[PDB]
UniProtKB/Swiss-Prot annotation, chain A:
This is RNA polymerase sigma factor RpoD. It comes from the Bacteria. The lineage of its organism: Bacteria, Pseudomonadati, Pseudomonadota, Gammaproteobacteria, Enterobacterales. Signal peptide: none annotated. Contains 4 domains, connected by flexible linkers. In the active conformation, the domains are in an extended conformation, each making extensive interactions with the RNA polymerase catalytic core. The gene is rpoD.
From Swiss-Prot, chain B:
Co-administration of salinamide and rifampicin or salinamide and myxopyronin suppresses the emergence of resistance to both antibiotics. The gene is rpoB. The RNAP catalytic core consists of 2 alpha, 1 beta, 1 beta' and 1 omega subunit. When a sigma factor is associated with the core the holoenzyme is formed, which can initiate transcription. The rRNA transcription and antitermination complex (rrnTAC) consists of RNAP, NusA, NusB, NusE (rpsJ), NusG, SubB, ribosomal protein S4, DNA and precursor rRNA; S4 is more flexible than other subunits. In pull-down experiments interacts with CedA. It comes from Escherichia coli (strain K12). It comes from the Bacteria. Acetylated on several lysine residues in the presence of glucose. The chain holds residues 349 to 398 of 1342 of the full protein. DNA-dependent RNA polymerase (RNAP) catalyzes the transcription of DNA into RNA using the four ribonucleoside triphosphates as substrates. Resistance to the antibiotics salinamide A, salinamide B, rifampicin, streptolydigin, CBR703, myxopyronin, and lipiarmycin can result from mutations in this protein. This is DNA-directed RNA polymerase subunit beta. The lineage of its organism: Bacteria, Pseudomonadati, Pseudomonadota, Gammaproteobacteria, Enterobacterales. Belongs to the RNA polymerase beta chain family.
From Swiss-Prot, chain C:
GO terms for biological process: bacterial-type flagellum assembly; bacterial-type flagellum-dependent cell motility; cell motility; cellular response to cell envelope stress; DNA-templated transcription initiation; intracellular iron ion homeostasis; nitrate assimilation; protein-containing complex assembly. Its EC number is 2.7.7.6. InterPro entries: DNA-dir_RNA_pol_omega, Pol_omega/Rpo6/RPB6, RPB6/omega-like_sf. It comes from Escherichia coli (strain K12). Coiled coil: none annotated. PANTHER family: DNA-DIRECTED RNA POLYMERASE SUBUNIT OMEGA. Promotes RNA polymerase (RNAP) assembly. Latches the N- and C-terminal regions of the beta' subunit thereby facilitating its interaction with the beta and alpha subunits. It is an enzyme of class 2 (transferase). The RNAP catalytic core consists of 2 alpha, 1 beta, 1 beta' and 1 omega subunit. When a sigma factor is associated with the core the holoenzyme is formed, which can initiate transcription. The rRNA transcription and antitermination complex (rrnTAC) consists of RNAP, NusA, NusB, NusE (rpsJ), NusG, SubB, ribosomal protein S4, DNA and precursor rRNA; S4 is more flexible than other subunits. GO terms for molecular function: bacterial-type RNA polymerase core enzyme binding; DNA binding; DNA-directed RNA polymerase activity. Keywords: DNA-directed RNA polymerase, Nucleotidyltransferase, Transcription, Transferase. It catalyses: RNA(n) + a ribonucleoside 5'-triphosphate = RNA(n+1) + diphosphate.
Curated annotation (Swiss-Prot), chain D:
Zn(2+) 1 binds at residues 63, 65, 78, 81. Changing residue 758 to A: Resistant to antibiotics salinamide A and B. The RNAP catalytic core consists of 2 alpha, 1 beta, 1 beta' and 1 omega subunit. When a sigma factor is associated with the core the holoenzyme is formed, which can initiate transcription. The rRNA transcription and antitermination complex (rrnTAC) consists of RNAP, NusA, NusB, NusE (rpsJ), NusG, SubB, ribosomal protein S4, DNA and precursor rRNA; S4 is more flexible than other subunits. Zn(2+) 2 binds at residues 797, 871, 878, 881. The keyword Metal-binding applies. Mg(2+) binds at residues 443, 445, 447. This is DNA-directed RNA polymerase subunit beta'. Belongs to the RNA polymerase beta' chain family. Coiled coil: none annotated. Its cofactor is Mg(2+); Zn(2+). Pfam families: RNA_pol_Rpb1_1, RNA_pol_Rpb1_2, RNA_pol_Rpb1_3, RNA_pol_Rpb1_4, RNA_pol_Rpb1_5. Binds 1 Mg(2+) ion per subunit.
Length: 57, 50, 90, 1160
């Protein structure tokens, strides 16, 4: 709910791919080098449909 | 509205949450949770506006 | 033809095909049986082939045919050795 | 009966997973030790990362120990040490492997965007696939009771479920567990049952995941790859030479990071193997397995999770993937500072003595040993190293007709590299012909160019027949001349006209050439009088040839002598009667079109020589009195400040709106700026008095500065206005304008204040330039990546349809006509004539036949013309449908390279585009190409019907329009925000405007039409070039829009599977081959789909080509999953592989090989 709704509604499409935004709006231990690539991958390239593959993953 | 969105309720949960935000890993304690927040804006060897 | 090279393309369209056939001829000259048709006048094989194409002689079909005759000259003239080898393994 | 088993020619490359046995096939031994080189002897260890027995020998032909040394034993392995003694390059090609104990997950197929191992298995990635293989939560592997088939259990849940049943549902955890999961998975039976279940009574609430996975599973099963290969049990080893450890200077070795990676994985792997023999505490072993996982994952690709470190460097270690994820140096090359070379021809360049000596080194060697002089090759070296006089004469022989091609740093378009005939010059600088000095955008600020030597035979002919400067007369972008004379030469020929009255004038008549004798011998001037002479003209008509025409015309001294340079044909005199300005290029253009190449080339060299020589004679300079200020300057300034003073007093006493008095006072100064500007020009323009016969008369100023401005040669109105007039409104960092314009000018003194103000303009000028220069190339890269694969082929197809070309008319309310946009265009079909006949069907509109389209009056302002937008070609472009516009005058040669040349011409003028209901600039060009929806998109009527409100705000909602007529309705969604344009009851057509706002190209293509959307993109992208004043042909825009509309979407039922959006390439070829194959009902109808440059370029057949620009880790992986193969037609992918390019001089080669690969 929170992660999915916030991610989608905000990113439309954040213009210049404002990375430094939603990564703060995420739970668990922060400052990681693991969760990084999972966001840079979805936003662009395969737009629209990719944003529906992200939540299901 | 800021208080309405504040999970912490006291000094312990506050210093602990900060300790978990800064150093996410080891279990927050009493000495660690306190000394950390003190060694951020309340220690000459760890902070200085000059 | 040391400044176009345009007169050559009129005789054979497609500047790319021109390069292929002209290099093909220039290759024949540089290595192997030279024998230019237009007088040299101290010009590189690079341009000599182009001079010929402009002149009207030596095109793509012309070289292919002269290669056919060249093959018929090397083969049919020296078939006495091949036939001798043919009987080698029965 | 071929079946050859050697390294011969290949037609394609395949990409797929590698079986454990597939890895073994490469194995020339197994690395078993973390050891590399000896600590004392500096010798390859036994079975380390750098073995000699496994990989290759250190020295060339001598083995490790030394039992065998020379070429005696090149096929036999050594006795004491199994070292095959062949080459040392063997060390560069030999593989090898490491065999791990417990299975390991391949980092790519595990965590690379979509979980390949997960989506194939249907299982969450970092959530479930992690916890079950990091030894945390055991997974099931198929059960026939209670438990399912892939649930996740905890230790407590495991033993509980084990106690209830057990010994009949056994399911492990970890890597090998996922192995049995992928292995037990039946791609066949699942492919069936998935098709069954995911098609039973389900609307669009499911079809998403349904169609997706079924296509993925069908692909992978058809790929040939077994899912066992996903996680590897055998990890191959990279050849040692590709990751060496070489001694530097005085010890201190230099090694690759891969050695650290392979050394770590080996250590952890061996410890694991050791623990699987000694006591095996579950915690100890399971951790070491996870540690082996870490090492392997780090070696394959770091990325990604913390980044392995060590190696003393605080920076991460360069893994295999990072070495292949993301400039071609070449022999026989050089560079130097460029210098003007006036004495040269258009096909020549000044190549320094010592430079050319070193560049043609191997050619000099060969020719020396050929003639004599040098007894042997090493004698030639010693002979040229001791530059011995005679060698230079040999050099003069080798560079004779051996073209060298020059290149400048910023290569924006094709004319960046042009070939010349090498001309020896005693110096160390490289001289260049001043005509093609504009094509390079080159100045002599100290700019430096590089040179290349065409080594191959056909490489020289390519440089001579294609890249040779004489073949580049016209610009590829626009049909106009590119080698057109510039500043110096142009001012020269402007001086050779300019009719001055009297002053050693008088109309003493003669006959052309003799006039030369008159000029050198003084008496008469040169710019008089006018004077009459006999001109022997030459014209042709109908049957060509030449027709003389002697007459008596009133020219000047300059025009008469200048006439000598003009070639045989041409209208004559009248071309000289004008002046030297823009017509200077016009004269060159017409000459090229009516004469040919050679006559134009020599004509260019001659007009260049003339301009320079007579320009020197003229001695035009720039003193301080040359930029005359107006006398009404102080007057106009006082009057302007008088007006604003009154406006400020009004603001003081209220009255006028103080909130925007700022704007109107700016208008005051803006008018005042135009007043001083107009005064300065009207004064500095005319002036003068002379004294003709009885004195008193006026012409135009011979004021040097004006002459430069009135003849190209870098001199515009604005700059001159700043020189003598005034610098107008200056910008402020805020973006606002200052209400105190720079009253002074450069001729006068400049106060510190207004200079500290103008410095902002200079700063933002240079800065904005620095941005748009890099952003221009940034756009070009996208243009090329998407367009650089199409080439004109299959000669000339049929088809007549094509965009109806009409003069771009803003004349609706501003008056602005441009009707030269039809020339060198192939006609659609006989486009009528106010009467009958005329224009043929496929007749390409000649340059003289477009001038014939004026003899049919202003009535005919519409012609249907074949374009790349249409054309029923398949994987290329019809030659006719294109046009002809090149440096060449005829139609494009079959098998050219339309793509790259199009992108270049479009992105070349990107240097001169200012970034910002009118965006304007380079950014506007980008958005138009990307096909981005506006911030406030308008709406259109999909079907023609009757407009009526569909429930006033009943949702949700937000208004609703419903155009219903004939049959079936529609419900569009209006969001209250923004008004309307059509009342209720009124009828609309198929695609009418109902928002009167910015239009979206998606809707236009989808509804209006392809001719409409392409017409929109071309006319809209041009409109931003109109303002910037950059001329660029419409063809190239259509070229990119062509494959910008590459793919489509099918909606019905056919051999293609519906929801799939496939390109019309495969579609059209498959729909043509179905109406006459079995039945037209086994195929669907498609629908063109607009997609931007990036979105279009993202899709492409070659996986190597994709691995070029887009994320290599992604494309290479997903292309590995399915049994893909590149084969092998594109440009980009055929370049990196290092073979002939399927275009131009190639093409023929590829076409032969393409048909050749039809046997099997
Ligand atoms: Mg410069
Ligand atoms: Zn040995
Ligand atoms: Zn066509």
């Amino acid at each position: 709910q929170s992660q999915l709704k916030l991610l989608v509604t905000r990113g439309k499409e954040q213009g210049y791919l404002t990375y430094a935004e939603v990564n703060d709006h995420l739970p668990e231990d922060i400052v990681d080098s693991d969760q990084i690539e999972d966001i840079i991958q979805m936003i662009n390239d395969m737009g629209i449909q990719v944003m529906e593959e992200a939540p299901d993953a | 509205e800021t208080l309405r969105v504040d999970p912490t309720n006291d000094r312990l949960s506050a210093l602990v949450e900060i300790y978990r935000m800064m150093r996410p890993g080891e279990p927050p304690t009493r000495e660690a949770a306190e000394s950390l927040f003190e060694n951020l804006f309340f220690s000459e060897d760890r902070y200085d506006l000059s | 033809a040391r400044v176009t090279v345009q007169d050559a393309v009129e005789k054979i369209g497609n500047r790319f095909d021109l390069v292929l056939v002209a290099a093909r001829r220039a290759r024949q000259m540089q290595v192997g049986g030279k024998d230019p048709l237009v007088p040299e006048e101290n010009d590189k094989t690079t341009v000599i082939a182009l001079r010929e194409i402009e002149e009207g002689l030596i095109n793509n079909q012309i070289l292919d045919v002269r290669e056919r005759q060249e093959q018929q000259e090397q083969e049919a003239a020296e078939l006495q050795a091949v036939t001798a080898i043919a009987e080698g393994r029965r | 009966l071929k079946a050859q088993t050697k390294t011969e020619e290949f037609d394609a490359i395949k990409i797929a997973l590698a079986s454990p046995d597939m890895i073994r096939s490469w194995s020339f031994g197994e690395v078993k030790k973390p050891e590399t080189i000896n600590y004392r002897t500096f010798k390859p260890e036994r079975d380390g990362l750098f073995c000699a027995r496994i990989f290759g020998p250190v020295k060339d032909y001598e083995c490790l120990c030394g039992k065998y040394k020379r070429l005696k034993h090149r096929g036999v392995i050594c006795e004491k040490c199994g070292v095959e003694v062949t080459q040392t390059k063997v060390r560069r090609e030999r593989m090898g492997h490491i065999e791990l104990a417990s299975p390991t997950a391949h980092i790519w197929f595990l965590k690379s965007l979509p979980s390949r191992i997960g989506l194939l298995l249907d299982m969450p990635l970092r959530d479930i696939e992690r916890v079950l293989y990091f030894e945390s939560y055991v997974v099931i592997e198929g059960g026939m009771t209670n438990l399912e088939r892939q649930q996740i259990l905890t230790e407590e849940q495991y033993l509980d479920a084990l106690e209830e049943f057990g010994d009949e549902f056994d399911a492990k955890m970890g890597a090998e567990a996922i192995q049995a999961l992928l292995k037990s998975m039946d791609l066949e039976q699942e492919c069936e049952q998935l098709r069954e279940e995911l098609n039973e009574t389900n609307s669009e609430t499911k079809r998403k995941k349904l169609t997706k996975r079924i296509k993925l599973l069908e692909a992978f099963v058809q790929s040939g790859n077994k899912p066992e290969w996903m996680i590897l049990t055998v990890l191959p080893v990279l050849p040692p030479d590709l990751r060496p450890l070489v001694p530097l200077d005085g010890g201190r070795f230099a090694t690759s990071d891969l050695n650290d990676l392979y050394r770590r994985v080996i250590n952890r792997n061996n410890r694991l193997k050791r623990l699987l023999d000694l006591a095996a505490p579950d915690i100890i072993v399971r951790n070491e397995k996870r540690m082996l996982q870490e090492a392997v994952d780090a070696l394959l690709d770091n990325g990604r999770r913390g980044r392995a470190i060590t190696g003393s460097n605080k920076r991460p270690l360069k893994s295999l993937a990072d070495m292949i994820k993301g400039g071609k140096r070449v022999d026989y090359s050089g560079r130097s500072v460029i210098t003007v070379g006036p004495y040269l021809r258009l096909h020549q360049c000044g190549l320094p003595k010592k430079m050319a000596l070193e560049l043609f080194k191997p050619f000099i060697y060969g020719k020396l040993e050929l003639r004599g002089l040098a007894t042997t090759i090493k004698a030639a070296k010693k002979m040229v190293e001791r530059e011995e006089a005679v060698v230079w004469d040999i050099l003069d022989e080798v560079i004779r007709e051996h073209p060298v091609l020059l290149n400048r740093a910023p290569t924006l378009h094709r004319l960046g590299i042009q070939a010349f005939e090498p001309v020896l010059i005693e110096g160390k600088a490289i001289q260049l012909h001043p005509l093609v000095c504009a094509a390079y955008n080159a100045d002599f600020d100290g700019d430096q160019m590089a040179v290349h030597v065409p080594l191959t035979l056909e490489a020289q002919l390519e440089a001579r027949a294609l890249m040779m400067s004489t073949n580049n007369i016209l610009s590829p972008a626009n049909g106009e001349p590119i080698i057109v004379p510039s500043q110096d030469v142009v001012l020269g020929l402007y001086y050779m006209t300019r009719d001055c009255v009297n002053a050693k004038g008088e109309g003493m008549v003669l006959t052309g050439p003799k006039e030369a004798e008159r000029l050198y011998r003084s008496g008469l001037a040169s710019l008089h009088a006018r004077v009459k002479v006999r001109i022997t003209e030459y014209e042709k008509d109908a049957n060509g040839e030449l027709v003389a025409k002697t007459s008596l015309k009133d020219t000047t001294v300059g025009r008469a002598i200048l006439w000598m340079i003009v070639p045989k044909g041409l209208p004559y005199s009248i071309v000289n009667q004008a002046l030297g300005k823009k017509a200077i290029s016009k004269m060159l253009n017409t000459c090229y079109r009516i004469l040919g190449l050679k006559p134009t080339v020599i004509f260019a060299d001659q007009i260049m020589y003339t301009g320079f020589a007579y320009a020197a004679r003229s001695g035009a300079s720039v003193g301080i009195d040359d930029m005359v200020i107006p006398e009404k300057k102080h007057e106009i300034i006082s009057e302007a400040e008088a007006e604003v003073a009154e406006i400020q007093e009004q603001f003081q006493s209220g009255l006028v709106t103080a909130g925007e008095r700022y704007n109107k006072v700016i208008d005051i100064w803006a008018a005042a700026n135009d007043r001083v500007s107009k005064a300065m020009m009207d004064n500095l323009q005319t002036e003068t008095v002379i004294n003709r016969d009885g004195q008193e008369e006026k012409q135009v100023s011979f004021n040097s500065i004006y002459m430069m401005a009135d003849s190209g040669a870098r001199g515009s109105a604005a700059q001159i206005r700043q020189l003598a007039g005034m610098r107008g409104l200056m910008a402020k960092p805020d973006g606002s304008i200052i209400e105190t314009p720079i009253t002074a000018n450069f001729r006068e003194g400049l106060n510190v204040l207004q200079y500290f103000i103008s410095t902002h303009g200079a700063r933002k000028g240079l800065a904005d330039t620095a941005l748009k220069t890099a952003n221009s190339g940034y756009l070009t890269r996208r243009l090329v990546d998407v367009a650089q694969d199409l080439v004109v082929t299959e000669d000339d197809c049929g088809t007549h349809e094509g965009i109806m070309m009409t003069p771009v008319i803003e004349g609706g309310d501003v008056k602005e006509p441009l009707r030269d946009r039809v020339l060198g265009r192939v006609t659609a079909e006989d486009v009528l004539k106010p009467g009958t006949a005329d224009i043929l069907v496929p007749r390409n509109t000649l340059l003289h036949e477009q001038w014939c389209d004026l003899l049919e009056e202003n009535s005919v302002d519409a012609v249907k013309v074949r374009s790349v937008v249409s054309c029923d070609t398949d994987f290329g472009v019809c030659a006719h449908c294109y046009g002809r516009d090149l440096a060449r005058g005829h139609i494009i040669n079959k098998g050219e390279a339309i793509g790259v040349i199009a992108a270049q011409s479009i992105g070349e003028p990107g240097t001169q585009l200012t970034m910002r209901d009118i965006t304007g600039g380079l950014p506007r060009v980008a958005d138009l190409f990307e096909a981005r929806r506006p911030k406030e998109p308008a709406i259109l009527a999909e079907i023609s019907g009757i407009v009526s409100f569909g429930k006033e705000t009943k949702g949700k909602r937000r208004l609703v329009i419903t155009p219903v007529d004939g049959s079936d309705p529609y419900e569009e969604m209006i969001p209250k925000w923004r008004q309307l344009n059509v009342f209720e009851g009124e009828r609309v057509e198929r695609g009418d405007v109902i928002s009167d706002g910015p239009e979206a190209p998606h809707d236009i293509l989808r509804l209006r039409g392809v001719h409409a959307v392409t017409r929109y993109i071309v006319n809209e992208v041009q409109d931003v070039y109109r303002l910037q004043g950059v001329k660029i042909n419409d063809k190239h825009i259509e070229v990119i829009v062509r494959q910008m509309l590459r793919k489509a979407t099918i909606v019905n039922a056919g051999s293609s599977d519906f929801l799939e959006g496939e390109q019309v390439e495969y579609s059209r070829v498959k729909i043509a081959n179905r109406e006459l194959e079995a039945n037209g009902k086994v195929g669907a109808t498609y629908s063109r789909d607009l997609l931007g440059i990036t979105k279009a370029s993202l899709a492409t057949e070659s996986f190597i080509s994709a691995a070029s620009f887009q994320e290599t880790t992604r494309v290479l992986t997903e292309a590995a999953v399915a049994g893909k193969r590149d084969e092998l037609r594109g440009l980009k992918e055929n370049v990196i592989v290092g073979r002939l390019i399927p275009a131009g001089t190639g093409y023929a080669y590829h076409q032969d090989r393409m048909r050749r690969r039809a046997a099997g």
